[PDB]
Amino acid sequence: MGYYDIDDVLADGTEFPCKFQYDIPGLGYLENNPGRPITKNTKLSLPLWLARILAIVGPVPFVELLPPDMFSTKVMNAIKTDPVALDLHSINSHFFSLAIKWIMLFSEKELANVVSELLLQRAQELNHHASSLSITNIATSTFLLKLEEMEKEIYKKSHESYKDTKRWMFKK
Amino acid sequence: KIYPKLHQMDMDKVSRVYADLRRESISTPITVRHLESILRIAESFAKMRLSEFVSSYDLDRAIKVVVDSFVDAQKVSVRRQLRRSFAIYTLGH
Amino acid sequence: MYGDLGNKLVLEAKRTKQLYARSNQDVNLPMYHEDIIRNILKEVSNLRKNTEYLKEQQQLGMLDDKVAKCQYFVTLLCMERNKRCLLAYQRLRTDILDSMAWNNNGLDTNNLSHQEQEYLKEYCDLITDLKSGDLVDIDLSGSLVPPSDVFIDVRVLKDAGEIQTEYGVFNLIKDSQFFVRQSDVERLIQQGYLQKI
Amino acid sequence: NDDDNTEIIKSFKNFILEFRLDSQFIYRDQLRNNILVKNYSLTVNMEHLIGYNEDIYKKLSDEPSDIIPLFETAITQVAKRISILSRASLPTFQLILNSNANQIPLRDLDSEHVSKIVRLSGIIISTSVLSSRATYLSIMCRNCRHTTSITINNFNVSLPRSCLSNCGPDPYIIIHESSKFIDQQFLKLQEIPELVPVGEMPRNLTMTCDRYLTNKVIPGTRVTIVGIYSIYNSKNGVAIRTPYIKILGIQSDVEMFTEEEEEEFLQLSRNPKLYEILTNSIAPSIFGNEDIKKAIVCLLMGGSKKILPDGMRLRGDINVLLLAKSQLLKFVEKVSPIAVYTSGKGAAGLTAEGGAMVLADGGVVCIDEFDKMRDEDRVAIHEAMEQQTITTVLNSRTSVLAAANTTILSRFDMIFIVNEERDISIANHVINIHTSEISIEKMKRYITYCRLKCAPRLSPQAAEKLSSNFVTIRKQLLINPITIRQLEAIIRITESLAKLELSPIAQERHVDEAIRLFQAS
Amino acid sequence: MSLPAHLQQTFSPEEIQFIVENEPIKIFPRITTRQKIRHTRWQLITTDDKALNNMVAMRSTEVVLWIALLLKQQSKCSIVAPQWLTTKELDRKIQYEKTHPDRFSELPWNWLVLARILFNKAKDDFHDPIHELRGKIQDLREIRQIKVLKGLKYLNESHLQLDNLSLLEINELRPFITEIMDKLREIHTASLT
Amino acid sequence: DAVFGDRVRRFQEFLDTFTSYRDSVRSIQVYNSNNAANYNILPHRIIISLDDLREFDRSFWSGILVEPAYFIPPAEKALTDLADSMDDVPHPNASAVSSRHPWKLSFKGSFGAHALSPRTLTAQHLNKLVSVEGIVTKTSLVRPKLIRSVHYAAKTGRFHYRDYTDATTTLTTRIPTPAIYPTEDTEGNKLTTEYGYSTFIDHQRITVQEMPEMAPAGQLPRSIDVILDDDLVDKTKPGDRVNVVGVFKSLGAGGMNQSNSNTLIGFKTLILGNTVYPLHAARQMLTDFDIRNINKLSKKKDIFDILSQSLAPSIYGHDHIKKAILLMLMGGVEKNLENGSHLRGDINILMVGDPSTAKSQLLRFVLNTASLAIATTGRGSSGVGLTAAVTTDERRLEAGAMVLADRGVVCIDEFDKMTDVDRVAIHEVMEQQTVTIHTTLNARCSVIAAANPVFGQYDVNRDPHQNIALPDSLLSRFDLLFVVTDDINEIRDRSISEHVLRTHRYLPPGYLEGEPVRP
Amino acid sequence: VRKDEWTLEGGALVLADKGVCLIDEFDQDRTSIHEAMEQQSILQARCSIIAAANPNGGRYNSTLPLAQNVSLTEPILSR
Amino acid sequence: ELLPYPHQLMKRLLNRISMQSQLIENISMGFLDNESKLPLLCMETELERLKFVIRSYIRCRLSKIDKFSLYLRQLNEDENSLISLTDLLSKDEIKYHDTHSLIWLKLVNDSILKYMPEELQAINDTEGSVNMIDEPDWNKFVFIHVNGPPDGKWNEDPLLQENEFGKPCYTVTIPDLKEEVELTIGSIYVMRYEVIRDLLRDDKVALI
DNA sequence: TTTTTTT
């Protein structure tokens, strides 16, 4: 999550729904209307880097973020059913980082517990896949397609470590 | 038992003749497929002579056969002009 | 938006980082994203002009306390995001260049920018200078692999011809094997002339 | 016997535990990996086991059908030992094997070949749907209400008549819930045409597969099967039997970029002369016809597809019409990621069943002789190629190419018609046969990659240029008809041209190129 | 950068082998490097030279494992097999692991690497057949792997204890376990007010 | 048995944990009593969240998934006991007491691996609860079952009853019941079957083809039959997507029996659906806040203008046609007189314009704007087909395109290209609002028509009817006739070019510039 | 094609292989010939083509070019 | 975190390496003029291994210096920092850090800071939401093996204390959870580097 | 078997 971290930059660039708590003339560029003043109660998705700051500051905060479908209770129920079967990458490549940022902006113990359980199950599956080494598979391909980009990087690191260890063991 | 082999010098003359035949078809068609058919008919004439190497006369008679095919196509329309233009081209020898 | 170009540049940086992590051997780095960088710089110049206009509006005094403050804050945040993206991409490319200099220059100029090429030359000069002086006894450019094998059979991957040794000249005639200490043949292996006996 | 069978299972387990490919036991490691992937099965190479342990292979060849279940039981025992901690059963593990021996022709297979392992090759005519085989059962005796379990191996048993706690004639009745089942697929494999004697149709044989062996292949695929020739009697000559081959293993003859792989596409996009290079590589033997090559490239790229919020959708494919074009169409069929080359015969229609136009999706679809063919008349083709749709409707979202020698021309995005040194060079190449440059596959992959990666839109300058040119053309025509359909065709051509460079937006240069190409219409 | 990306988190198996080589090992010399009262010298700056210079034929002596293997490359050196590297000791460790699924057998942290290196080179010195020792090592590795799987099932963000686990096993598990525990700790911290 | 009793107690504990489930069972009972008094009776079927059963006991939910036969029957028995206790059951009929309707149980949401498709269905899923989704196909016609063959021995005064069980109907395997009415009573008096007292529940078993998009290329989609009973029967029809929470069940000998010599056949597998859910993939939903907003919109000075401007906002120059389309979407009022005369509740509009005038684009936008719409193209549209359709099947009648969505509007491209005979068949729809073949199909649908001039370019000198291919009688049959055609003006051309450029410049929220999509 | 079960029978052009095949009345047979000439496949004909076609189904007339006398392809005439 | 540079130990090792190389060269001259080169090969391999270890440690130190160049400039500017930059680094390390930071600052300034407004032109400023200065993660988890007390006597170490089953242990606390735990002597554990740093400075535990 | 009608 570094300042120069490209993945963190992309996750911050991701937009989230929000509802305006203020009416600001001259902010029509965010509205995408050249001369229309911003209005209170207006609903507009905003980039996470800007939406989070607007939710933090404003006293009444300047904007209030609406709950995303990635944070929807239906997605939560699907995760509680089967953490592995869900396509977290299709939902968001930075879904875990976005969940962590949403927990930081709004402390949610149950959400953190559900996210941790999903991460643990997906990590067990990813560890099984990484332990499976060549002496592309459809099952691993579908699992990676479900797996987010960060989880795929972790899986690549673990699988490369296992493959290097096996190669060094089987070769002089 | 015999596999005809195209002669290189006769084939050079036949390639010049094939360019001339395409030009004559434009004048009054002829195709690289027809030139390949000339090579095959030269193989056929070598077979008729039972020669493993295609004769220059075999290639010439094959060019004559392909020219006869071109003349037969649109016979009344182009046959006289084709014969006049191909009196030298139909047979290399 | 203005930050979208920086996001695209950072996406290219992440793609190149994943590629370099995938390939152990150093590939020729992707050509510098001069187009996206120049677009981001033009956006930064436009935002600077907008901030100057906002300061002029504040001198006019209309809503300078709140509306102009928010507009200037938004423009400054956009400039900061663009600068962060550009710095991240440049740092990743420069780290790749430093790794390449450690790999080869210690023992694809079109892809690099001219400033990047000057920086890589300066890094190679710095490496040679660090080896040239104190701690010169150990070749800092020497391989980081532990000395597992004192002696190893060596033969030419290529017919380079005569080659120097500590006290010998060895012909590298094609497919000519040898039996020598690994340390002396480490430089020749780095040259690639001899591979695995 | 039963002690000998237990000894055979124990010997299989011992060989698995004590066989090491290179001082590392592949059998133990492969079984553990299959357990990790939850693969309740194991694949064993006959070469590794029988390279020096010939006695096991001899016993297996003696009684393969009965021996295999003992090997599977040994696999289950070894898996339980390796994976389940003691003092802290598993589903049956299928055994997969490969003969790795000389194949036998399907016609050469005879009655003596039955009851023995056979290696062969052929093309599967079809693959039957899965059929669950009851691996286990619980059979309740009706008259005394008590149950007795039954397990079945799908090799080479029926419900016992007696009740055995005998109160009934056939009182035993299965408990479907307690019964455990395994899917099984039947396969019909035709012999390879070379294996068929000259002047004879290939012979076909019924074959069976179960568990992981099911769905391992697809119908129509040439494949090499490892299986024991067997016999069975269908319920439907005298003493005649129905031959079949229980499969031990299958090896198919038929059989997303890396860090280095994607960089090649990046370089191809980096080339500024990429469009002209593609046009030149298309029909290299043909001299001239630059407009034809450019139109082919633009059709392969296709216009950008978009859907308006109101539900209106822009056509996502360019259409080209021609009036040696057959060679160009043959090249286009290979270069296109998806293409169907035909003279309109299909007797299947071009638009229809599924036509060639419907089967082709995106890419380009080429017709060798569109005007010559009259089946699947142009009335259906007009709707298909204009609205990308056809009381039957079929998707027709694929670039249209027509070779030959109105309303269809109005639907078409473009129209067209159809050197001695070129003839000499082509003749020299053909004679050598008889006695920029980019690979076709690489160019097809690059075209698909550009279509998947970028769908360029018109920049404001390109839109203004297109509007001004369209107004000028309309004024000239009024002074002298061009339609907004042709204007949309030109816009699609501009988007297709920008797609090669993968630019975020099209350019006035693309607009000029599209207008120049349209001038040939 | 100076440090490879894979090396940023964990030591390579070759590095673990180098550490194991830095460990010492007993061997039987075949050269009377010791000179009678009636010559080149090691003069090692990182290790004892007196043992090497005092080695005599068939006089058991201990030296750093790398130097021991270097001498074993010559016929002069024959490495002494570790006592725990015996069939009876391996069977005892296996029985201990079986009786204690929770508790790993007290094998050395470099037991796996040392057994592999000895099988590569010191297979001749083993009085017990090398194949039986290899099978026992594989069985112990499988038991330890099952125990590691159970422990991963019983992971906790606060801490973990692995007493008798092999150093190679710890190095292999460092990336995955460290990343998972760090992610869990980050989730718990974000949950914390 | 004892485990079944423990599961019944645990499911009663689940109903106690979620008061809403017990309240819903009692609500079905109370609604049944009130509706029986008023006359419309709710079936004794209960659907609960799978996550709710998991919250009550994760072990119970996973156990129902693993052994639906062992758990779901006891859980439904517990639900039925709770419903019997909660229900007043006033004045129960003897036939109702004989019926003794069980309270069905269903699991909703969070299926995971239990969520399935017919191609992905497995033998392990057999004897296990699952949720399968796919396009319905080959649905069986509803056939009444028999809960019990209630009988009555003659002169005995006692009604002997014989229950019958089906393996597909019951998740647990059972020895087959005779399913034959007893000829004589156990007492020895002659036994007569008691119709009415005997209970018959409708049973339907519908195959469910895997979704064609989900079907692999070069392969036919798999189909798994799902058992349906009571309200679940006839819940969906072939060609309609549906998702059913049903336990896959191994069944039959599968070649294990002695009669099957080949033994090649596998064990029959038939899913037993606890519930059937039709799925759109539509129909708009109205809430109180949106209704207040709609009241404010009606309070607006130009409500019709606001709605029309909202309709096809991207389309340019067709705003008057969009106002006419809003009038057609309302359709007007439909009236059936005491005399039987019919006033149509639909309005037909026709607009003629040259190709690429976007009149057909506005018609497509109207088809999208309508919750239900019929699409046709005059070159490809037959009026006989629009009025009615014939299927070979005895032949089965099929509704015509105009008859389809008989209340909804029908948008037709190239209506002028459609033949005049087709237009006469359409006139049967336009004026009579009904079609007669000897089968008769109602055709009161609105007919919005996109057309082109017969010349292909509208001429001011030519009359609008002369330019239109439709006859004057057809134009009179149409409620409105328009002439919206492509034209070239300088300022309007700049505006339309800016509109197309604005459509291109519109950026999907998820896709940035240079990224493909998907007052 | 015929039932055997189902079995297939080889075509006549396929039956004539490597030996010169024969054609007459040069239009479905012409399509088999012409698809063969462009395709190199009739299934490959694998045989030379010899034509004995009456011109336009009647006595030959000198005025008609061969393409009119027998319907065919110009590429077929070239081949 | 970068460890403090041991100048005396590094210098003594370097002097020993120099003397060993000189002696090996003298032996080589004598051989070129008993005669057993096996001890010479042993000394050469020992020198190679020692030089490799020293170079690896120095390269890791330079990597840490470049990773926290901003934080090291901040620490050098910060008199309140307990450790002087020269104390933490070697002389060559300090010169390298200074020159590298200056070169990077010149490059970044000429690249972007000329166009950037002066208020935001500062490279190491904390005004950004993510501080541009990069510092070592104290709380990062790192494996460790309890070395036990540096002294032979377990009782002599106050940190060492009897735990259950007669096992010496060292009490430790994780500030985030405020959890206290005892680490048995001669045992391996995984803990945050911040809490581990106390025992590491005490040398009671060595990082794995 | 005999319309019916779609190919």
CB-based touch A/H (3+ pairs, under 8 A): yes
Whether F138 and F153 map to the same domain: the answer is: no
Closest by alpha carbon to F274, among F67, F83, F115, F46?
F46
Please indicate if any CB of chain C lies within 8 Å of the CB of F513. yes
Whether C117 and C161 map to the same domain: the answer is: no
Across the strands, what pairs with D74? none
Half-sphere exposure of residue H136: CA atoms within 13 angstroms, side-chain side: 17
Using DSSP's 3-state secondary structure scheme, residue F193 falls into strand
Q: Would you call A119 and E183 a contact, using CB atoms and an 8 Å cutoff?
A: yes
DSSP string, C2-56: HHHHHHHHHHHHHHHHHHHHH-SS-PPPPPP-HHHHHHHHHHHHHHHHHHHHHHH
Nearest-CB residue to F501 (from D460, D470, D484): D460
Dihedral angle computed from the Cα positions of residues D42, D45, D50 and D52, in that order, rounded to the nearest 10 degrees? -100
Subunits next to H (3 or more Cβ pairs <8 Å) are: A, C, E
Whether C125 and C177 map to the same domain: the answer is: no
Closest by alpha carbon to A68, among A43, A85, A38, A87?
A43
Overall resolution, Å: 7.4
Please indicate if any CB of chain A lies within 8 Å of the CB of F110. yes
Task: Please give the Cα distance from F419 to F384 (Å, whole number).
Answer: 11
Task: Please give the Cα distance from E56 to E73 (Å, whole number).
Answer: 18
Task: Please give the Cα distance from B45 to B62 (Å, whole number).
Answer: 7
Across the strands, what pairs with D149? D138
DSSP state of F267: B
- Asked whether residue F17 is marked as a ligand-binding residue, the answer is no
Task: Please give the Cα distance from H143 to H191 (Å, whole number).
Answer: 6
CA F232 to chain centre: 13
Tokens of D414: 């473009």
**Taken in order H120, H125, H131, H132, is the CA torsion positive or negative?**
positive
Pairing mode, strands G49-52 and D400-402: unpaired
| Other CB atoms within 10 A of residue C133 CB | 8
Cβ distance A97 to A52 under 8 Å? Answer: no
DSSP state of D416: B
User: What is chain D's length?
Assistant: 521
Q: Would you call E15 and C146 a contact, using CB atoms and an 8 Å cutoff?
A: yes
Residue with tokens 């010492």: E24
Instruction: Calculate the alpha carbon distances from D185 to D129, D211, D247 in Å.
Output: 6, 8, 11
Q: Would you call F113 and A77 a contact, using CB atoms and an 8 Å cutoff?
A: no
Helix extents (H) in chain E: 13-22, 50-54, 65-73, 87-99, 111-120, 130-153, 167-191
Instruction: Calculate the alpha carbon distances from A23 to A31, A39, C76 in Å.
Output: 11, 4, 21
Determine the number of helices (DSSP H) and then strands (DSSP E) in chain G. Answer: 4, 4
CA angle B28, B29, B33 (to 5 degrees): 155
Please indicate if any CB of chain H lies within 8 Å of the CB of A3. yes
Using DSSP's 3-state secondary structure scheme, residue D39 falls into coil
Q: Directed axis angle between helix F303-310 and helix F319-330, to 10°?
A: 110
Q: Would you call B32 and D435 a contact, using CB atoms and an 8 Å cutoff?
A: no
H or E element that contains F364: helix F359-369
- Bases along strand I below 7 A from a protein CB: 5-6
Residue with tokens 């307690």: D178
**Residue F298 φ/ψ, nearest 5 degrees:** -65, -35
Please indicate if any CB of chain D lies within 8 Å of the CB of A39. no
Technique used by the depositors: cryo-EM
How far does the CA of residue A110 sit from the closest CA of chain C (Å)?
Answer: 32
Closest by alpha carbon to E161, among H178, H152, H169?
H169
Cβ distance D104 to D204 under 8 Å? Answer: no
Closest by alpha carbon to D189, among D145, D262, D126, D100?
D126
H or E element that contains D385: helix D378-387
Task: Please give the Cα distance from D106 to H136 (Å, whole number).
Answer: 71
Dihedral angle computed from the Cα positions of residues B63, B64, B70 and B74, in that order, rounded to the nearest 10 degrees? 170
Q: Where are the beta strands (DSSP E) in F236-333?
A: 241-248, 250-251, 268-269, 271-278
Cβ distance G37 to G29 under 8 Å? Answer: no
Number of domains in chain C: 2
Using DSSP's 3-state secondary structure scheme, residue E106 falls into coil
Residue with tokens 């740092």: C91
Please indicate if any CB of chain D lies within 8 Å of the CB of E119. yes
Instruction: Calculate the alpha carbon distances from E122 to A166, D18, E29, E127 in Å.
Output: 21, 21, 14, 11
CB-based touch D/G (3+ pairs, under 8 A): yes
Q: Would you call D259 and C27 a contact, using CB atoms and an 8 Å cutoff?
A: yes
Q: Which residues are within 8 A (CB) of C147 and not within 5 positions of it... i.e. 6 or more apart?
A: C182, C183, H45, H48, H49, H52
Output the domain CATH number for residue F4. 3.30.1640.10
Domain that residue F249 falls in: 115-144+202-281
Across the strands, what pairs with D320? D401
User: What is chain C's length?
Assistant: 197
Closest by alpha carbon to D323, among D386, D409, D258?
D409
Task: Please give the Cα distance from B46 to B61 (Å, whole number).
Answer: 10
Task: Please give the Cα distance from B55 to B59 (Å, whole number).
Answer: 6
Cβ distance C119 to C97 under 8 Å? Answer: yes
Whether F107 and F119 map to the same domain: the answer is: no
CA D491 to chain centre: 35
Burial of residue C38 (CB within 10 Å: 0-12, 13-18, 19+) is exposed
Tokens of B7: 């002669």
**Taken in order E84, E90, E95, E99, is the CA torsion positive or negative?**
positive
CB-based touch G/A (3+ pairs, under 8 A): no
Residue of D nearest to F265 (CA): D131
Chain E positions contacting chain A at CB under 8 Å are: 6, 10, 12-14, 116, 120, 152, 155, 172, 175-176, 179-180, 183-184, 186-188, 190-193
Task: Please give the Cα distance from F248 to D290 (Å, whole number).
Answer: 62
Task: Please give the Cα distance from D517 to D292 (Å, whole number).
Answer: 9
Output the domain CATH number for residue D434. 3.40.50.300
Cβ distance A168 to E6 under 8 Å? Answer: no
**Residue C46 φ/ψ, nearest 5 degrees:** -65, -40
Q: Integer distance in angstroms from CA F423 to C1' I1?
A: 37
Task: Please give the Cα distance from D130 to F269 (Å, whole number).
Answer: 10
H or E element that contains F161: strand F161-163
CA angle E58, E60, E62 (to 5 degrees): 140
Cβ distance D323 to D415 under 8 Å? Answer: yes
Whether C123 and C133 map to the same domain: the answer is: yes
For an interface test with C, which of A4, A14, A149 has the most C Cβ atoms less than 10 Å from its Cβ? A4
Task: Please give the Cα distance from F310 to D358 (Å, whole number).
Answer: 36
CA F218 to chain centre: 29
Cβ distance D122 to D195 under 8 Å? Answer: yes
Q: Would you call H49 and C147 a contact, using CB atoms and an 8 Å cutoff?
A: yes
Instruction: Calculate the alpha carbon distances from F343 to D76, F333, F432 in Å.
Output: 77, 8, 10
Q: Would you call E191 and A112 a contact, using CB atoms and an 8 Å cutoff?
A: yes
Write the Ramachandran bin of F162: left for phi over 0, alpha for psi from -120 to 50, otherwise beta. Answer: beta
Tokens of B42: 């030269």
Closest by alpha carbon to F277, among F403, F133, F420, F459?
F133
Pairing mode, strands F128-139 and F241-248: antiparallel
Residues of F in contact with D410 (CB under 8 A): 355
Cβ distance F33 to F96 under 8 Å? Answer: no
CA angle F87, F88, F89 (to 5 degrees): 85
Task: Please give the Cα distance from F128 to F252 (Å, whole number).
Answer: 17
Tokens of D117: 């392992």
CA angle E172, E177, E183 (to 5 degrees): 145
Nearest-CB residue to C67 (from A7, A26, A156): A26
Whether F139 and F255 map to the same domain: the answer is: yes
Whether F100 and F119 map to the same domain: the answer is: no
Instruction: Calculate the alpha carbon distances from D137 to D131, D152, D167, F220, F251 in Å.
Output: 16, 8, 20, 31, 11
Closest by alpha carbon to F227, among F148, F135, F139?
F139
DSSP string, chain A: --TT-HHHHHHHHSEE-EEESS--TT-HHHHT-SSPPP-TT-B--EEHHHHHHHHH-----SEEEPPPGGG-HHHHHHHHH-TTTS-HHHH-TTHHHHHHHHHHHS--HHHHHHHHHHHHHHHHHHHHHHHS-----HHHHHHHHHS-HHHHHHHHHHHHHHHHHHHHHH--
F384-405 per-residue burial string, b: 16 or more CB within 10 A, e: under 16: bbbbbbeeeeeeeebbbbbbbb
Across the strands, what pairs with H180? H173
Write the Ramachandran bin of H148: left for phi over 0, alpha for psi from -120 to 50, otherwise beta. Answer: left
Output the domain CATH number for residue A118. 1.20.58.2050
Domain that residue A15 falls in: 3-171
Closest by alpha carbon to D384, among D422, D416, D420, D356?
D356
Task: Please give the Cα distance from F333 to F434 (Å, whole number).
Answer: 17
Cβ distance D227 to D117 under 8 Å? Answer: yes
CA D223 to chain centre: 14
Whether C66 and C44 map to the same domain: the answer is: yes
Using DSSP's 3-state secondary structure scheme, residue F183 falls into coil
Structural domains of chain H, ranges and CATH numbers in brackets: 1-134 (1.20.58.1030), 135-207 (no CATH)
Task: Please give the Cα distance from F373 to F379 (Å, whole number).
Answer: 19
Task: Please give the Cα distance from B42 to B13 (Å, whole number).
Answer: 13
| Other CB atoms within 10 A of residue H166 CB | 6
Domain that residue C177 falls in: 144-197
Closest by alpha carbon to C151, among E18, E70, H49, E65?
E70
CA E140 to chain centre: 14
Tokens of D194: 């070379």
Closest by alpha carbon to F386, among F396, F368, F399, F371?
F399
- Asked whether residue D324 is marked as a ligand-binding residue, the answer is yes
**Taken in order B82, B83, B84, B88, is the CA torsion positive or negative?**
positive
Cβ distance D155 to D66 under 8 Å? Answer: yes
Across the strands, what pairs with H160? H170
**Taken in order E153, E157, E158, E164, is the CA torsion positive or negative?**
positive
Cβ distance D513 to D290 under 8 Å? Answer: no
Instruction: Calculate the alpha carbon distances from C128 to C107, C122, C131, C165 in Å.
Output: 10, 10, 5, 22
Whether C125 and C49 map to the same domain: the answer is: yes
Q: Which residues are within 8 A (CB) of C36 and not within 5 positions of it... i.e. 6 or more apart?
A: C5, C8, C9, C12
Closest by alpha carbon to D404, among D330, D321, D346?
D321
B73-88 per-residue burial string, b: 16 or more CB within 10 A, e: under 16: bbbeebbeebeebbee
Whether F8 and F133 map to the same domain: the answer is: no
Cβ distance D187 to D128 under 8 Å? Answer: yes
Using DSSP's 3-state secondary structure scheme, residue B5 falls into strand
Domain that residue D517 falls in: 259-521
Q: Directed axis angle between helix A48-56 and helix A6-13, to 10°?
A: 70
